[PDB]
Amino acid sequence: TEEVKRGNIEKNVVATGSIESINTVDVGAQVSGKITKLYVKLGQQVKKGDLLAEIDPATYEADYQSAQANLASTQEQAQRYKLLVADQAVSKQQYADANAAYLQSKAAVEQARINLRYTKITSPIDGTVISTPVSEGQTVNSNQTTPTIIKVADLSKMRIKPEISEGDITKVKAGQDVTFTILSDNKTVYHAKIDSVDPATTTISDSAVYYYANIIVENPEHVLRIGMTTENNIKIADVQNVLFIPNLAVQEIGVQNDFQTEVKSGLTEGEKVVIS
Amino acid sequence: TEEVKRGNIEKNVVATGSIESINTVDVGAQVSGKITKLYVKLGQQVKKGDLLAEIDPATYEADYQSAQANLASTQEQAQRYKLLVADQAVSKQQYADANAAYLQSKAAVEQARINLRYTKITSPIDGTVISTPVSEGQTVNSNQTTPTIIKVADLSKMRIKPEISEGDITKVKAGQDVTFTILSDNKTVYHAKIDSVDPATTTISDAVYYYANIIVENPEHVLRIGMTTENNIKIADVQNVLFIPNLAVQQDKYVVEREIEIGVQNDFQTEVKSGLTEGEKVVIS
Amino acid sequence: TEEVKRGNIEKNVVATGSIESINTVDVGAQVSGKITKLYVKLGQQVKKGDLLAEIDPATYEADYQSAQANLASTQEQAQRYKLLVADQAVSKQQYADANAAYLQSKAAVEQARINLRYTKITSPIDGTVISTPVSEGQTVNSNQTTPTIIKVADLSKMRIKPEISEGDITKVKAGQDVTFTILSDNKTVYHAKIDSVDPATTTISDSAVYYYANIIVENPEHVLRIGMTTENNIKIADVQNVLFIPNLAVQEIGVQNDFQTEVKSGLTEGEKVVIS
Amino acid sequence: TEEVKRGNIEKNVVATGSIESINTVDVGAQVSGKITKLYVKLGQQVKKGDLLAEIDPATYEADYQSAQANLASTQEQAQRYKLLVADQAVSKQQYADANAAYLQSKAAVEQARINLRYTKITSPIDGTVISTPVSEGQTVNSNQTTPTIIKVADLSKMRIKPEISEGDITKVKAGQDVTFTILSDNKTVYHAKIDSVDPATTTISDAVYYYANIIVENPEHVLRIGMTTENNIKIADVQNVLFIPNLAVQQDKYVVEREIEIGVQNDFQTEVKSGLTEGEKVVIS
Amino acid sequence: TEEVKRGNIEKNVVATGSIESINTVDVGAQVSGKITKLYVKLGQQVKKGDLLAEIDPATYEADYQSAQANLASTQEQAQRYKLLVADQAVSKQQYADANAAYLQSKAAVEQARINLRYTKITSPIDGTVISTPVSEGQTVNSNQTTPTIIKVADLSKMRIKPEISEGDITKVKAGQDVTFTILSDNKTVYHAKIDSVDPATTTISDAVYYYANIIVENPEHVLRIGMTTENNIKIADVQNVLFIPNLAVQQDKYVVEREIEIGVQNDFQTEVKSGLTEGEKVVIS
Amino acid sequence: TEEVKRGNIEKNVVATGSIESINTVDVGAQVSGKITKLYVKLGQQVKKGDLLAEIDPATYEADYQSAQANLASTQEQAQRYKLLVADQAVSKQQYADANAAYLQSKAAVEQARINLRYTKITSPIDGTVISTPVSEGQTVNSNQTTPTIIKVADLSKMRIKPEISEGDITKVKAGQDVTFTILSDNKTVYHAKIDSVDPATTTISDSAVYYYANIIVENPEHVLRIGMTTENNIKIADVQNVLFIPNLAVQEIGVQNDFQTEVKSGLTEGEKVVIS
């Protein structure tokens, strides 16, 4: 039920997208020691650096006392020899060692002040709380296994990850128009564009070889989510306006797709089919 | 095979809930060294901070002696120079170092006093004892793998985790009325509401699912915790529009006729949009 | 071949018990360093704290010399200034520092004396030796992986663990009479009582959901053992003395069991069946 | 089809024995650092403590120099004040500190001398070399994973481990006569006795089994170690009662007749209790 | 069915190539502590040493203050005693210790300056960014598990890894002409040469295979890296001897006749040794 | 088609050999810290100790400065008191402490000189490079997981590992003549002898029980390789010259092999068969 010409070729490829958030981060600090006060739940919206947080801060407060006293000393000291030499009382060598003990005891102050700034947790981006692995009583411990402790990420702006593959990868470039949809609200179709390839076999990012090729786009509302899978198709050609042979020239010039080719050379219209 | 005056549907979805306790925590300390005295058996009711607990406290008592002597010294010292300068005997610089040794030896006292407060265990909430992995003779050790040592949690108030999924997730919101029940006492049905979604694929909390927790108070023992439940969740309720027992079945198209508009159904007992008035030519079979 | 009344209902449930010892502990110390002398085998009866034991004690003896000399010093010292001031010879500040070096050198003595008490092993209960993972030549090492080194536990008093399940758990309470038996001596049947539930899905203690419910009881002789599995049944009801309808009232009032119900309301006797 | 005067049964059980060496040990030291000289190849006969061995000893020789100088000092010192006071020159308090520095610097000498004695390897028993996991160039390292480095064990005297099981375990005791054989030399049969049970499910030492070891001297090479054996174990022996080739087969009940009493059999050649006298009407088929 | 004058064969073998980049490296430093500023996204072209990078540098700046003061001191000091002795004021032994404190405090300055140079990341080659495992908030930590943190490598010049195997390995040497192609652009065929064997079972680099790498310049993006290729490798080429389309098929024996001598074939189009002259009685079918 | 006598029995056993190199070693040092310069590729021939190597040597050069200055000091010092006492100027106790600081500062010199000798890598045998796991940029790190970093071994002299088994192990001794071949060049057959058993179930070296029994032999050229598998057969008997009954004496005296026995007692020749 077909004949000649037009210009509606759409070549497409299709793979299936695992969808994602644009960023996304796990958080637990260089400290050890059990925790005390936990500030969030499930899926809170959180703006920058917040309160999460807090391992018991106890011995770090200790070490603050100890380096702030031994700083009050050296401070008074070289503040006093800051007024000798300025007469010419004692030396220019007794100044070097009063400054040394000062600077050294200020350093060692900003140090254990840091290890207190550790004990306080902070969210590394304004975002939303995915996970909360970790609990008010929880005797965490670092050393060599960072813990994480809160997971959080950004869900306006999401980005989908089309497990595309080894064959069709000489094509799929950037900026190709794509459409895709879910599995959750079939009457929709989302369009976007394709935004970047990888150049990385998605084993190699984070038998059976895929090459992601991310597409981003803003989720307003909270509609989408994150684990989700999508079905997606990606125009790898578009000639508006040449010549179309509903398929079979089988038992010249391309390309064929899907089974519905495409006349370039020469020719022109008017013509035939195959039947049968 | 007519109307329903105007009528009343329940769309529901259903998934299967792994049930849970509201909170729940594992406990074992920053210390190492073997233990000595263990205070609970599973399924003890425990109120706050209690006695669990206790790794052998031996070398931590040592370090208490050693920092409390070296504190008795500096305390006497700068308590003595606290009465010089207040004459004007010795200086204002020999005070700085008597205070330094004091503060420093008080600090290092609160430190090893802390590492004794570690050795003593405490329960991070008033609750009940799930597990007791760990035993009177047991030569535990921290460093880099925290142990836990007691698990304990709260079982009045429980919360169930309906492994719901990728399809139906555009719906299920919060505050939806839900009912569910177990596998253990079939003549029951518990109602509750739905209390929160996640926004998190339940791999990503802790084949694609998205939990959506529902809480509610367990009085008595009754429920438990490992349990699974079967649960169904009203994703619509129109009290009072028009009901076509299903088929006008398809660019959807709808036999007797006219055509209609549509939606929605469930379990296969579709709903009208115009339609259609009352009585009409009812379409079957 | 049946009619009315009585009072022999036994509802029962049944699951299969993995049997156990009441306690049970693994043992290897905070030390490192290879071992030397090992005192037990296979399944010895052992009473408290014994000799197991002993990593090579060598450098810990070293550190005993070193802190016991530096203690002989301070001891002589402040024993000598314990007799000044008691005249009024030297000061009250030279006493503080002689006591300090004393206390400090006694502390540091009880410390490396402890690290020698480590090197000696001890059994944390009068019991019996399950396992002996670990051998006269064996270059063990702690740090962050405790070793264990002997396993030992108590086998008078055993306790069985009936993998019971998600359905029948609204019933099975405590104090229910139970019977169970093995797989090794079929002409027996052991009775006991049920002694505690858990409230813990036996994944959660130490697809497919079970809830243990321990039952203890004394193994005299050594007959039972430990790995064993048992088959067990647990009276979750007993009405002595109401009304019994050999089953089928199918195509009122309960409960039914197994297929052999149970008349409450109203009624009385004399009556029928089903046939057919 | 009569009696057996009085007769002689063997009940047996049978399981399959994984065979073993009596002892057996893995060896690699508290040290780190690469190695240098390796003294054995597998299947060397070795007698006690030998030369294995040797991680590069380099920095441990360093720490020997450094603690042996600082010992030469304190030795000369308090050897000198060992001749004051014995006049009455200098004090009784300057002796305390010369002794302290002495003892302390002898201690710290026996310490780094020890960490040299580590660097040298030694075989924890006179025996034979199973394995040699570890090589002349091999940059080993301890800390928290002890290495092993040579495995060695004793192969005169071996001991076989009959994966026996949950049923038959109420029987099999110690001192039962056993026979077993391999898979490698079928015309043999080795007898021994059974020497110990366990009381330990062979998951729990190191589908339910309970080992029950049997030892015996391997002279020559002959046996080996990975081997499996097939073994059978007399759990009864009545020399001299009455034997009914099996069936009176069932509340057990026993055809010709009369009835009997019973037990026991094996492999299906049952035994009488009364019974039954001599000759009788033999029941078959 | 005759001769080939003298004729021209291609034996080939074939295996399937996993393709690769020439180099390729993972990068994350000796430091610990969380990060702060991250400079790249995957698939950035990067030239040498760049900005990646940066764990929070905080306490390393601290230790810079502390060792640069204690250096200002000793510098002034021995700069002052650099002008004694050059009179002859104080000694030649008070110089030794002023130099010692100097050198020692310069050393400990280059040390903590180093641990700041750590905190800054750098790309170990001019190349392109594969991976970016690691994120602006990410609380990394070293010690004993190096992290990596960026992966990057070189994609002009790629090299393909033909999982070739245990049989054909006595052949395939180096410098053999090869052709191969993908799975993604079938109208192509890439030729190259073979550039090296391994001598290493490709389990042992990083069912038995032996890689045998072939390199060649990827200009443009075109290829990629995960890819598989299908590749065939001329293990013989006699231009110009005699060709018997196969069968004289067997102590091998060769119908029409006479007999021949033989080899070799492929895919089943065998070759003569005498044979046989021209024309002859061609054997079929 | 057979009769009596001779002396061509060959009993043989057969198993399949995984072949190997005689030695073989993995190499990466006690250091940490990233690397810098890497000297080899794929399969280089390398003679002893070479250049491989080199983690960035930076802070180890630091610690060389620091202990070589503090050595220049003590060296000058006790070189100066080496000329007192030799008059009789200052004491015999001030010498002890000048020597102490000297020896101690020489020790501490050979120490950080060692930690520089670490940073330089060296091949633990003249051989060939199997593997090169590890790369110019590679931020390696030891502590508790040695890295390895180059793998290298010897491929003249190879040694094959005949997964032989639990049955036939009462036989296979040493010095038995063996032949074997590959899978890669069928027209060959290599002979060798058998050179050692193990006494070790090849799980136990480095359901289903094998016992290796190595055979070595020189690979000249580079022909063999290493991953390879071989098929091998091993004469466990050879009587040249007794009496041979093509098999079946079935429905005396052995042994039988394969199905082609072997007359000892008594007898003599001339005789029969089985047919049928």
Q: Which two tokens stand for residue F227?
A: 């991953």
Task: State whether A139 and A46 are in the same domain.
Answer: yes
Domain that holds residue B83: 57-120
Task: Give the residue on D whose Cα is nearest the Cα of F94.
Answer: D73
Whether B249 has its CB under 8 Å from any CB of chain C: the answer is no
Helix (H) or strand (E) holding C112: helix C94-119
Please give the angle made by the CA atoms of F142, F143 and F147, to the nearest 5 degrees: 30
Separation between Cα atoms, residue B25 and residue B39, nearest integer Å:
17
CB atoms within 10 A of CB B7: 15
Please give the angle made by the CA atoms of E245, E251 and E256, to the nearest 5 degrees: 35
Task: State whether A209 and A224 are in the same domain.
Answer: yes
Cβ partners under 8 Å of residue E216, min gap 6? E157, E158, E159, E190, E192
Number of domains chain B is built from? 4
Instruction: Check residue D204 and report its DSSP letter.
Output: T
In terms of DSSP H, where are the helices of chain B? 58-80, 94-119
Task: State whether B165 and B227 are in the same domain.
Answer: yes
Separation between Cα atoms, residue E15 and residue E230, nearest integer Å:
6
Indicate the residue of B136, B144, B221 with minimum beta-carbon distance to C124: B136
Task: State whether B182 and B92 are in the same domain.
Answer: no
Helix (H) or strand (E) holding E67: helix E58-80
Instruction: Check residue E246 and report its DSSP letter.
Output: S
Q: How far is F107 from chain D (nearest CA, A)?
A: 5
Q: What percent of chain E is helix, strand and coil (3-state, nearest 5)?
A: 20, 20, 60
Q: Which two tokens stand for residue F189?
A: 């057959």
Task: Give the residue on B whose Cα is nearest the Cα of A224.
Answer: B170
Task: State whether A148 and A249 are in the same domain.
Answer: no
* Residue that finishes a domain, picked among D130, D157, D184: D157
CB–CB of D18/D224 below 8 Å?
no
CB–CB of A20/A162 below 8 Å?
no
Contact at CB, D201 and C225, closer than 8 angstroms: yes
Separation between Cα atoms, residue A182 and residue F237, nearest integer Å:
72
Cβ partners under 8 Å of residue C186, min gap 6? none
Cβ partners under 8 Å of residue B174, min gap 6? B194, B195, B196, B197
Residue with tokens 């801060």: A57
CATH of the domain at C202: 2.40.30.170
Q: Is the peptide bond before D25 cis (omega within 30 degrees of 0)?
A: no
Per-residue burial over A42-74, b if 16 or more Cβ lie within 10 Å, else e, is bbeebeeeeebbbbbbbbbbbbbbbbbbbbebb
What does residue D229 show for φ and ψ, rounded to 5 degrees? -130, 160
Separation between Cα atoms, residue E165 and residue B191, nearest integer Å:
65
In terms of DSSP H, where are the helices of chain D? 58-80, 94-119
Instruction: Check residue D229 and report its DSSP letter.
Output: E
Edge-to-edge strands, sheet with F177-181: F190-193, F177-181, F229-234, F14-21, F158-162, F215-217
Three-state SS for A53? coil
CB–CB of D181/D214 below 8 Å?
no
Whether D93 has its CB under 8 Å from any CB of chain C: the answer is yes
DSSP string, chain F: ---S---------EEEEEEEES-EEEE--S--S-B------SS-EE-TT-----B--HHHHHHHHHHHHHHHHHHHHHHHTTSSSSSS-S-SSHHHHHHHHHHHHHHHHHHHHHHHHHHS---SSSEEEEE----TT-----SSS----EEEE--SSEEEEE--BTTGGGS--TT-EEEEE-SS--S--EEEE-----SS-TTT-----B----EEE---SS-S-SS-EEEEEE-S---SSSB---S---------TTT---B-SS---S------
Separation between Cα atoms, residue F213 and residue E7, nearest integer Å:
49
Separation between Cα atoms, residue A257 and residue A237, nearest integer Å:
10
CB–CB of B236/B264 below 8 Å?
yes
Instruction: Check residue B170 and report its DSSP letter.
Output: G
List chains touching A (3+ CB pairs under 8 A): B, E
The 3-class SS string of B81-139 reads CCCCCCCCCCCCCHHHHHHHHHHHHHHHHHHHHHHHHHHCCCCCCCEEECCCCCCCCCC
Separation between Cα atoms, residue A107 and residue A104, nearest integer Å:
5
Helix (H) or strand (E) holding C127: strand C127-131
List chains touching D (3+ CB pairs under 8 A): C, F
Separation between Cα atoms, residue A256 and residue B206, nearest integer Å:
48
Indicate the residue of D27, D170, D199 with minimum beta-carbon distance to C139: D27
Separation between Cα atoms, residue E52 and residue C103, nearest integer Å:
54
* Residue that finishes a domain, picked among F106, F141, F157: F157
DSSP string, D233-264: E-S---SSB-B--S--------------EE--
What does residue C127 show for φ and ψ, rounded to 5 degrees? -170, -145
- The closest alpha carbon to B32, from B136, B109, B145, belongs to B145
Separation between Cα atoms, residue C222 and residue C21, nearest integer Å:
12
Q: Which two tokens stand for residue F233?
A: 């057969």
Separation between Cα atoms, residue D95 and residue B75, nearest integer Å:
31
Instruction: Check residue E174 and report its DSSP letter.
Output: S
Separation between Cα atoms, residue D96 and residue D89, nearest integer Å:
15
Separation between Cα atoms, residue E24 and residue E9, nearest integer Å:
39
CATH of the domain at B42: 2.40.50.100
How buried is residue F205: exposed, middle or buried, by Cβ count under 10 Å (0-12/13-18/19+)?
A: buried
Separation between Cα atoms, residue B120 and residue B49, nearest integer Å:
10
The number of angstroms, rounded, from the C-alpha of E6 to the middle of its chain's C-alpha atoms is 43
Helix (H) or strand (E) holding C63: helix C58-80
Residue with tokens 């644009």: A22
Task: Give the residue on C whose Cα is nearest the Cα of D112.
Answer: C59
Helix (H) or strand (E) holding E129: strand E127-129
Q: What percent of chain C is helix, strand and coil (3-state, nearest 5)?
A: 20, 20, 60
Residue with tokens 């810079």: E64
What does residue C46 show for φ and ψ, rounded to 5 degrees? -135, 130
CB atoms within 10 A of CB B79: 11
Separation between Cα atoms, residue F143 and residue F147, nearest integer Å:
9
Selected residue of D105, D122, D170 to mutate for chain C interface (largest C Cβ count, 10 A): D170
- The closest alpha carbon to B234, from B164, B160, B162, B171, belongs to B171
Q: How far is D12 from chain F (nearest CA, A)?
A: 24
DSSP string, B23-41: -EEEE--S--S-B------
Longest dimension (CA), chain A: 116
Whether A97 has its CB under 8 Å from any CB of chain E: the answer is yes
Task: State whether C231 and C249 are in the same domain.
Answer: no
Separation between Cα atoms, residue B274 and residue B6, nearest integer Å:
13
CB–CB of A154/A219 below 8 Å?
no
- The closest alpha carbon to D221, from D4, D12, D21, D3, belongs to D21
- The closest alpha carbon to E55, from E77, E32, E74, belongs to E32
CB–CB of F162/F15 below 8 Å?
yes
Q: Which amino acid is at F51?
A: L
Three-state SS for D152? strand
Task: Give the residue on E whose Cα is nearest the Cα of A147.
Answer: E139
Solved with: X-ray
Helix (H) or strand (E) holding C19: strand C14-21
Polymer length in residues for chain A? 276
Q: Which two tokens stand for residue A134?
A: 């970790």
CB–CB of D155/D218 below 8 Å?
yes
Separation between Cα atoms, residue C30 and residue C142, nearest integer Å:
6
Task: State whether D97 and D186 are in the same domain.
Answer: no
Task: State whether E67 and E113 are in the same domain.
Answer: yes
Three-state SS for B253? coil
Distances (CA, A) of C186 to C189, C230, E180: 7, 11, 70
* Residue that finishes a domain, picked among B138, B157, B176: B157
Q: Chain F partners of D70 at a C-beta cutoff of 8 Å? A: 100, 103-104
Query: Alpha-carbon dihedral of residues A217, A222, A224, A228, nearest 10 degrees?
Result: 110
Q: Which two tokens stand for residue D65?
A: 């120099």
Task: State whether F230 and F276 are in the same domain.
Answer: no
Task: Give the residue on E whose Cα is nearest the Cα of A142.
Answer: E141
Task: State whether C103 and C200 are in the same domain.
Answer: no
Cβ partners under 8 Å of residue F253, min gap 6? F262, F263, F264, F265
Contact at CB, E77 and A99, closer than 8 angstroms: no
Separation between Cα atoms, residue D99 and residue D95, nearest integer Å:
6
CB–CB of C236/C171 below 8 Å?
yes
- The closest alpha carbon to B215, from B184, B194, B231, belongs to B194
Helix (H) or strand (E) holding B178: strand B177-181
Quick one: resolution in A?
3.5
CATH of the domain at A61: 1.10.287.470
Separation between Cα atoms, residue D221 and residue B263, nearest integer Å:
85
Separation between Cα atoms, residue F117 and residue F31, nearest integer Å:
10
- The closest alpha carbon to D81, from D95, D69, D101, belongs to D95
CB–CB of A224/A207 below 8 Å?
no
Separation between Cα atoms, residue E57 and residue E116, nearest integer Å:
7
Q: Is the peptide bond before A267 cis (omega within 30 degrees of 0)?
A: yes
Task: State whether E192 and E222 are in the same domain.
Answer: yes
Task: State whether E164 and E231 are in the same domain.
Answer: yes
Indicate the residue of D26, D199, D200 with minimum beta-carbon distance to C138: D26
DSSP string, A213-276: --EEE---SS-S-SS-EEEEEE-S---SSSB---S---------TTT---B-SS---S------
Cβ partners under 8 Å of residue A240, min gap 6? A7
Residues facing B262 on adjacent strands = B272
Q: Is the peptide bond before C255 cis (omega within 30 degrees of 0)?
A: yes
Polymer length in residues for chain F? 276
Q: How far is F69 from chain E (nearest CA, A)?
A: 6
Instruction: Check residue D80 and report its DSSP letter.
Output: H
Is the pair F, B in contact (3+ CB pairs within 8 Å)? no
**Dihedral sign from CA coordinates of F3, F9, F15, F21:** negative
Separation between Cα atoms, residue C85 and residue C108, nearest integer Å:
27
The 3-class SS string of C160-207 reads EEECCECCHHHCCCCCCEEEEECCCCCCCCEEEECCCCCCCCCCCCCC
Q: Which two tokens stand for residue A168?
A: 């069709």
CB–CB of B109/B67 below 8 Å?
yes
Contact at CB, E185 and A168, closer than 8 angstroms: no
Per-residue burial over D249-285, b if 16 or more Cβ lie within 10 Å, else e, is eeeeebeeeeebebeeebeeebbbeebbeeebeebee
Q: Which amino acid is at E153?
A: A
Selected residue of A146, A165, A202 to mutate for chain E interface (largest E Cβ count, 10 A): A146
Contact at CB, F183 and E203, closer than 8 angstroms: no
Q: Which two tokens stand for residue B120?
A: 């003593």
The number of angstroms, rounded, from the C-alpha of D130 to the middle of its chain's C-alpha atoms is 14
Separation between Cα atoms, residue E65 and residue E57, nearest integer Å:
13
Residue with tokens 């010879």: C89
Q: Which two tokens stand for residue E76?
A: 């002034």
CB–CB of B200/A132 below 8 Å?
no
Surface of D (140-199) touching C: CB under 8 A: 142-146, 148, 166-170, 196-199
The number of angstroms, rounded, from the C-alpha of C21 to the middle of its chain's C-alpha atoms is 7
Q: How many CA atoms lie within 13 A of D31 on its CB side?
A: 27
- The closest alpha carbon to F212, from D138, D130, D19, E201, belongs to D130
Indicate the residue of C73, C133, C141 with minimum beta-carbon distance to D146: C141
Q: How many CA atoms lie within 13 A of F45 on its CB side?
A: 4
Separation between Cα atoms, residue F188 and residue C131, nearest integer Å:
54
Whether E130 has its CB under 8 Å from any CB of chain A: the answer is yes
Instruction: Check residue B166 and report its DSSP letter.
Output: T
**C to D CB pairs, distance under 8 Å:** 136
Separation between Cα atoms, residue F63 and residue F73, nearest integer Å:
16
Separation between Cα atoms, residue A27 and residue E205, nearest integer Å:
36
Surface of C (32-71) touching B: CB under 8 A: none
CB atoms within 10 A of CB A14: 14
